[PDB]
Write a protein that binds this ligand. Structure first.
Ligand code: ZN
Length: 27
C-alpha cells in the first residue's frame, strides 16, 4: 500500500497489486 515511498518500481509496479505490495515494503 502507500506506493509514494518508492513509486513501487522495485516492489512490483510493473504488474503487482497494492494489497500484494506490503510483502516487499512492510506496509
Ligand atoms: Zn508496491
Amino acid at each position: 500500500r502507500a506506493p509514494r515511498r518508492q513509486g513501487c518500481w522495485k516492489c512490483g509496479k510493473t504488474g503487482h497489486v497494492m494489497a500484494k505490495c506490503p510483502e516487499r515494503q512492510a506496509g
